[PDB]
Design a protein around this ligand. Structure first.
Ligand code: CDL
Ligand code: PC1
Ligand code: PC1
Ligand code: PTY
Ligand code: PTY
Ligand code: HEC
Ligand code: HEM
Ligand code: HEM
Ligand code: HEM
Ligand code: LMT
Ligand code: LMT
Ligand code: FES
Lengths: 124, 71, 244, 111, 61, 85, 54, 383, 110
């Protein structure tokens, strides 16, 4: 899937009062059970990056954000290999789980999808 | 004489008594049914194999170890 | 399927050779050979066993050569190219009772007695099945069983009707070692013997397995020490991050 | 009686069918038959049922005289064949194949 | 948390006698044991396995 | 997507100090008893449902099916078998 | 202990030689030890135990 | 520059087994790759050895296997090792494929190693099936009969193809000789494809259990994974030893110790345990051709996982619903296995059909649905 | 030098492959070939005779020898193929020589 698709669909759900009332609590529990925060990851650290689009979005990250991401990946890898979980300040608190990457990938994809559309234009 | 004979008899009278009685009752029914005429022109002819298996399976469970101990 | 169609499953008897560290009882093997020779060999072949195979298992070299030398086997033709017989040698296979399948079936009301060299591996149950079968002919078939002609009722045999009649009765064999030859004793001995025939490497196999288990276990323990030793720098790594 | 002749490794069932057997086979309405055929299509001589005795399901050999339509019973998956060797009950899709056989003499056939 | 000259705490894992010959020797005894059983195991494996190529019992008769 | 040593394809790293000690200076089995007990308990407890639920369900299914099949091929199950065929 | 290290471990040529000599000794002695153990747990069962009758 | 890097030949070994950069957090399920390599080596060594004692003629095949068991020095070991390692090869291969599905190893950028892998799995099935026939016992024959009669369902040409493969009108001597030649050859083909899937993988490197990049933190393949691979080698050899020396016939079927008899059909023809799930799938479809297509599709459908998994996240470590669905999928695959060996009787007929539907619906319906919904939950749940 | 040296081994494997293949026919030249050639191994001091009997699988060329040569003759061509591939990979570093013996780096053709 494209991040664009995920973001658009999520926005449709958050708009509908009924839908949000039932989905947002589920999604919060899902994320709690998912347990990525116990390895000190932010959600966006889990998105697959071996794609041209994602490589481009990562290159567009501000240097600080990029350095921090590298640290979170290295730290998580070390907890994984040790079979330990994050404790204390290493655990990602819900307020720290910011979508740092979503804006960049949405811009990269926006252009890529426009390019595909315009490659198929027909002068009327 | 064959040790198995005594061990099998003892296990039938003792721990496998319910199964012994089942087989016996079955045999009674089937023999009586065979005695009656137009048995040969019946659809279903009952056997006692099931009950026999239940009994033998039980006897073997209670005897196997004891028998090989005396050979 | 009906249980009848499957056959009754044989009990698990405590054979001497059951057990990771247990060999066959060779005295039982010898007695079992004598039952084979005096009872089964009338109808059943043991084609995969040579006289040499008994040597140092059940019999001395002299006893086995004596058994071989009592028989006649086909020799190479003489100088006029006429057929000839010779006395048996240790390399000869134990000869069967019938020349071909047709002769075998004709003697057994149509049924073909299988070769027994692999029968312990060729039936679910193994020794237990052979033991159960030979000892499991009831005096009377369960009421309501209709036996086909030339069949005998035996619950362990799938379908119930077997072409082999009960053959082991108290004192059909006179054991040379003074063991009382009861039906159960003879079945236990012959079933041991046939199990040996099917897997003659059994004793050596289990001893080599014991050595293998020990060495491989030790190497496993040491491999874990070595792994943990070499990996400890990676497991013990620590980081300090100062955001730039 | 039914004979079993090996012919190309497959078994050949040859049954010398009695009068009443032929009658039994000529009863079943063709309509109600997975593989619709009459005995006349199968045999070229009503007293000589010649079939390839491999079951049409997977390819086990039916035990003859057994069954529920008293012809042949495949023990493998329990499919019942007729006195024509037509499939009546069980997994098997087709009737037991008929080889190409010709009566050279009235006492010998080639297959 | 900030100074990189303050080495993190390794005291749970540090051996006191780490620079002794005793210490090294022990670990090489483990490595050497493992090599010894591997050598003995390889010899056994090879010798048993290749013996299949020697004259079989029927030939020897 | 992966390079080689020296140009592996990491985003630039800066600001991480890594420290480790020699295998000969470390106790390889330090805290092994605590880990074998408490760590394994934690890790197993966390994953237990994902094994228990599917295994227990499929075992129940099989148990019911095998018991029915057994019963259909008894004398008592003759009629139910006749309908099932 | 330093002595032991210096002699048998420091040079790999010596270490490998020590491992192979140990392997030889282990192989020989382990064979003998298992043989005896196997004979004791399977006592009176093996051909060697009944051979004497013949 | 070091010789291992300078010299072209050495450098190829170096790049794969020594300096190869690996993620530092591979868990023990990454060890099945090397166990499969060990199985492949044991099968080549024992296989070539048995070929030196086996005779491919149908009048002599079964007897040659008895000669191996009875006369050849350590023949029993070589035979049982070869037969049991075939079972261990399938345990390891199912584990390795299970690892790949759970951790999303099939996703970009690793679609090519995965797709070659699916072919390796097909060649392993064919290899093992032909090897089974070589014994020429009852299961050998009745296996070859049944399986090669499925080819008859190919429309128009099917019958002709069967007779061409058998080299006659039934399974017999021609079939046995040709299966021997092919069974010898197929493991070499399998080795080449195994090597191709590794070369394909070298572009991306190994995935890891977190599903994130490992480019940030790599470890040389040697010594770390060398020594970790030894632990599973010794664990494998312990299991091998228990089967080969103590219970060599536990995984097999007694019927194969009866010489093939084209007349007598054995009590029950079931394949070797590792084929049983596909056999259950085949039984589920009543149509002969349908059944064959379904059975092949059950393997080829693995090729579409790269499409039907719509997740933005690689692997199941962090996806609780996907983990549950995967658990059900795996257990159903085992239930299919068990239903492959029951009799075709009520109530297992219907049950086998339901399990078959569940098997396919994982790829076609559930995985696409579940992966889509988890995408939305991760995004909304972290807002 | 490396492609050349691997090549010398390819040539040895080809000789062995062809020799074993010749024995498989089991005609007179097959047998008498295997007899004489495997008795050259008898010249290896001390262990020579033992090695011969081990290769034959008996005391003469017979069935054991024939079966083992079949298995090896099947296998050896695959080994030969691997070495053929190694000598090419080795050669890839320098590329082909040419009949003038000069560099071709100045003038290449696909
Ligand atoms: C076959 C030939 C023999 C060769 C041996 C190879 C087998 C080794 C292997 O891959 O599995 C060991 C493997 C240990 O691997 P690991 O590297 O410690 O952790 C891998 C997972 O991340 C471990 O996952 P985790 O960290 O979440 O811990 C889970 C695990 C606990 O893991 C253990 O340490 C055990 O316990 C369970 O999941 C048990 C299920 C609960 C039922 C009660 O054990 C399991 O993971 C078993 C769970 C599988 C279901
Ligand atoms: C397969 C059979 C393997 C048999 C191993 C035979 C002995 C080699 C051995 O144990 O290696 C130890 C040796 C030494 O291990 P090491 O390299 O860790 O020791 C070097 C440091 N000193 C010399 C101070 C001990 O390993 C090798 O030489 C590699 C050969 C293994 C193959
Ligand atoms: C039986 C059902 C298995 C379901 C597994 C569910 C996950 C689980 O608990 O496993 C533990 C572990 C969980 O490991 P993990 O990597 O997800 O979690 C590690 C710990 N955290 C979450 C903190 C990062 O899963 C595995 O290791 C799964 C490997 C799959 C192997 C399956 C082989 C089956 C063959 C069928 C072939 C077709
Ligand atoms: C090819 C098949 C590989 C499978 C190997 C597993 C065990 C087989 C070994 C044979 C065996 O029975 O050996 C036993 C000891 O086991 C052992 O000690 C062997 C287990 C050790 C593990 C293997 C370690 C290396 C093996 C592989 C290397 C082979 C080629 C490399 C040069 C006892 O037999 P015995 O002690 O009577 O034997 C005579 C020497 N006294
Ligand atoms: C099967 C039998 C296993 C063989 C045992 C090998 C003996 C190991 C002891 C020797 C040892 O530790 O020294 C290292 C040798 O290991 C090595 O060089 C080999 C490391 C481990 C070998 C196995 C690698 C993976 C095994 C899985 C099989 C793969 C599938 C193919 C069948 C040197 O190395 P160092 O760097 O530690 O030395 C550090 C200083 N010099
Ligand atoms: C005079 C005939 C005869 C004697 C004596 C005889 N058998 Fe048999 N046996 C048969 C025949 C006939 C069959 C085939 C039965 C059938 O397939 O219905 C058979 C079958 C067997 C079977 C195989 C049953 C199966 O599962 O297929 C075993 C095992 C067996 N015999 C062992 C023995 C042993 C052990 C003895 C004596 C110690 C023995 N037999 C004595 C005629 C004999
Ligand atoms: C002879 C059979 C096989 C051998 C010897 C083999 C060997 C290996 C090895 C050594 C690796 C790298 C180490 C590892 O991850 O375990 C690997 C990775 C892989 N194999 Fe296999 N393999 C075999 C069969 C298969 C099959 C059947 C599949 C797929 C259906 C497959 C798909 C993969 C994939 C996708 C990877 C990359 C996984 C990753 O590291 O993320 N292989 N294999
Ligand atoms: C992936 C590799 C292989 C697998 C999975 C495999 C599998 C099998 C299997 C399952 C059998 C049936 C074993 C039995 O029940 O007795 C067998 C037999 C056989 N295999 Fe293989 N095999 C492989 C490689 C080889 C190779 C390379 C050879 C080289 C010739 C070979 C030669 C034989 C021979 C001669 C037999 C028949 C003797 C026997 O049954 O033991 N195999 N194989
Ligand atoms: C199966 C046997 C062999 C095959 C298939 C094979 C194939 C080839 C091929 C395709 C090339 C590159 C093209 C060419 O120059 O002709 C080549 C080059 C070469 N081969 Fe072979 N070869 C084989 C045996 C040998 C042998 C026996 C030797 C040496 C004793 C050898 C030594 C070389 C050398 C030194 C080159 C480089 C020559 C150059 O281009 O200047 N090869 N071989
Ligand atoms: C490059 C490697 C060097 C060449 C490799 C040599 C291969 C063949 C050498 C020995 C093979 C025959 O050597 C012989 O081995 C077998 C078992 O393996 C041993 O046999 C011994 O152990 C086995 C079980 O382990 C018993 O069944 C046997 O009764 C006993 O004598 C002999 O005591 C030994 O004389
Ligand atoms: C697995 C068994 C062990 C034998 C090796 C497997 C045989 C497969 C090797 C043949 C394929 C060629 O392998 C290919 O070669 C070159 C160098 O060797 C590697 O190249 C890699 O390593 C070298 C240095 O080590 C670097 O210059 C290069 O930047 C890097 O990508 C490729 O990543 C690999 O794909
Ligand atoms: S094979 Fe004939 S009934 Fe299935």
């Amino acid at each position: 899937a494209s991040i664009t698709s995920v973001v658009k669909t999520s926005e449709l759900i958050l708009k509908s009062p009924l839908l949000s009332k039932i989905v947002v609590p589920l999604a919060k529990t899902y994320v709690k059970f998912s347990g990525y925060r116990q390895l000190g990851f932010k959600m966006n650290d889990l998105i697959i990056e071996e794609t041209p689009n994602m490589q481009l979005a990562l290159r567009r990250l501000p240097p600080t954000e990029s350095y921090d991401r590298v640290y979170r990946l290295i730290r998580a890898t070390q907890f994984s290999l040790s079979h330990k979980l994050a404790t204390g300040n290493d655990i990602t608190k819900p307020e720290e789980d910011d979508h740092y990457l979503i804006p960049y990938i949405l811009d990269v994809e926006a252009e890529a999808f426009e390019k595909d559309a315009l490659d198929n234009l027909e002068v009327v | 004489p064959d040790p198995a004979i005594a061990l099998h008899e003892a296990a039938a009278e003792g721990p496998c008594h319910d199964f012994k009685h089942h087989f016996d009752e079955c045999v009674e029914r089937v023999t009586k049914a065979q005695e009656a005429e137009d048995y040969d022109h019946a659809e279903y002819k009952e056997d006692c194999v099931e009950e026999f298996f239940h009994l033998q399976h039980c006897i073997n469970d209670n005897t196997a170890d004891k028998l090989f101990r005396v050979l | 399927m009906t249980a009848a169609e499957h056959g009754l499953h044989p009990a698990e008897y405590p054979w001497p050779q059951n057990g990771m560290l247990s060999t066959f009882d060779h005295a039982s093997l010898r007695r079992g050979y004598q039952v084979y020779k005096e009872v089964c060999a009338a109808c059943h072949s043991l084609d995969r066993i040579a006289w040499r195979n008994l040597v140092g298992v059940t019999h001395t070299t002299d006893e086995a050569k004596a058994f071989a030398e009592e028989l006649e086997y086909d020799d190479e033709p003489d100088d006029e190219g006429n057929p000839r017989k010779r006395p048996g040698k240790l390399a000869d296979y134990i000869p069967g009772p019938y020349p071909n399948e047709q002769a075998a079936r004709a003697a057994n009301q149509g049924a073909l007695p299988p070769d027994l060299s692999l029968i312990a591996k060729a039936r679910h149950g193994g020794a237990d099945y052979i033991f159960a079968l030979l000892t499991g002919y009831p005096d009377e078939p369960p009421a309501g069983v209709v036996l086909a002609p030339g069949m005998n009722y035996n619950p362990y045999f799938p379908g119930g009707g077997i072409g082999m009649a009960r053959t082991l009765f108290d004192g059909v064999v006179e054991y040379e070692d003074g063991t009382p030859a009861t039906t159960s004793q003879m079945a236990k001995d012959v079933a041991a013997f046939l199990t040996w025939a099917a897997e003659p490497e059994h004793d050596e196999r289990k001893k080599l397995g014991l050595k293998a288990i020990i060495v491989i276990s030790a190497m496993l323990g040491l491999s874990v020490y070595i792994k943990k030793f070499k990996w400890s720098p990676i497991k013990n790594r620590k980081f300090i991050y100062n955001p730039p | 009686k039914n004979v079993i002749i090996k012919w190309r490794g497959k078994p050949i069932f040859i049954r010398h069918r009695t009068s009443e057997e032929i009658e039994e086979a000529n009863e079943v309405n063709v309509a109600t038959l997975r593989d619709p055929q009459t005995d006349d299509e199968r045999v070229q001589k009503p007293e000589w049922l010649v079939m390839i005795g491999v079951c049409t399901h997977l390819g086990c050999v039916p035990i003859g005289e057994a069954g529920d339509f008293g012809g042949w019973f495949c023990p493998c998956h329990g499919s019942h064949y007729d006195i024509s060797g037509r499939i009546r009950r069980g997994p098997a899709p087709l009737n037991l194949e008929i080889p190409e056989y010709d009566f050279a003499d009235a006492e010998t056939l080639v297959i | 948390g900030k100074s990189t000259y303050k080495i993190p705490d390794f005291t749970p894992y540090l051996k006191k006698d780490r620079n002794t010959d005793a210490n090294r020797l022990f670990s090489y005894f483990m490595i050497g044991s493992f090599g010894m059983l591997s050598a003995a195991g390889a010899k056994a494996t090879v010798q048993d396995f290749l013996s299949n190529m020697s004259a079989s019992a029927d030939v020897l008769a | 997507y992966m390079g080689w040593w020296g140009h592996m394809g990491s985003p630039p790293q800066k600001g991480i100090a890594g420290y480790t000690i020699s295998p000969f200076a470390a106790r390889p089995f330090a805290g092994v008893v605590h880990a074998a007990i408490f760590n394994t308990f934690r890790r197993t407890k966390n994953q237990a449902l994902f094994v228990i639920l599917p295994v227990s369900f499929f075992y129940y299914v099989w148990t019911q099916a095998s018991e029915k099949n057994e019963w259909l091929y008894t004398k008592a199950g003759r009629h139910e078998l006749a309908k099932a065929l | 202990a330093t002595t032991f290290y210096n002699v048998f471990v420091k040079r790999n040529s010596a270490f490998v030689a020590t491992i192979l000599a140990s392997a030889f000794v282990f192989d020989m002695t382990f064979e003998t030890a298992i043989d005896n153990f196997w004979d004791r747990i399977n006592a009176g069962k093996q051909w060697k135990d009944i051979r004497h009758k013949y | 520059m070091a010789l291992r890097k300078k010299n072209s030949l050495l450098n190829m070994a170096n790049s794969y087994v020594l300096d190869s950069p690996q993620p530092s957090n591979l868990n023990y399920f990454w060890n099945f790759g090397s166990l499969l390599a060990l199985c492949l080596v044991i099968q080549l060594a024992t296989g070539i050895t048995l070929a030196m004692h086996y005779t491919s003629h149908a009048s002599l095949a079964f007897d040659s296997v008895e000669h191996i068991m009875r006369d050849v020095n350590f023949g029993w070991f070589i035979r049982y090792a070869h037969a049991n390692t075939a079972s261990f090869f399938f345990i390891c291969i199912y584990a390795h494929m299970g690892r790949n599905i759970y951790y999303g190893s099939y996703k970009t950028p690793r679609v090519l190693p995965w797709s070659i892998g699916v072919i390796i799995f097909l060649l392993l099935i064919i290899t093992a099936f032909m090897g089974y026939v070589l014994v020429f016992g009852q299961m050998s024959l009745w296996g070859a009969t049944v399986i090669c009669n499925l080819v008859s369902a190919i429309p128009w040409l099917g019958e002709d193809i069967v007779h061409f493969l058998w080299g006659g009108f039934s399974v017999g001597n021609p079939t046995l000789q040709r299966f021997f030649a092919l069974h010898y050859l197929m493991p070499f083909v399998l080795a080449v494809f195994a090597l191709l899937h590794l070369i394909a993988l070298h572009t991306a490197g190994s995935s890891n259990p977190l599903g994130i990049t490992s480019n940030v933190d790599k470890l040389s393949m040697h010594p770390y994974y060398s020594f970790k691979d030894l632990i599973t080698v010794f664990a494998f050899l312990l299991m091998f030893t228990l089967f080969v020396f103590f219970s060599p016939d536990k995984l097999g079927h007694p019927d194969n110790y009866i010489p093939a008899n084209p007349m007598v059909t054995p009590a029950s023809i079931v394949p070797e345990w590792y084929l049983l799930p596909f056999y259950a799938i085949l039984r589920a479809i009543p149509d002969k051709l349908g059944g064959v297509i379904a059975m092949v599709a059950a393997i080829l459908i693995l090729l579409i996982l790269p499409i039907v998994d719509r997740s933005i996240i690689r692997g199941n470590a962090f996806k609780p619903i996907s983990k549950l669905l995967f658990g059900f999928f795996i257990c159903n695959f085992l239930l299919l296995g068990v239903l492959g060996q029951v009799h075709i009787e009520p109530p297992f007929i219907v049950l086998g059909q339901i399990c078959t539907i569940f098997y396919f619906s994982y790829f076609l319906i559930l995985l696409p649905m579940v992966s889509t919904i988890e995408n939305i939950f991760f995004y909304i749940g972290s807002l």
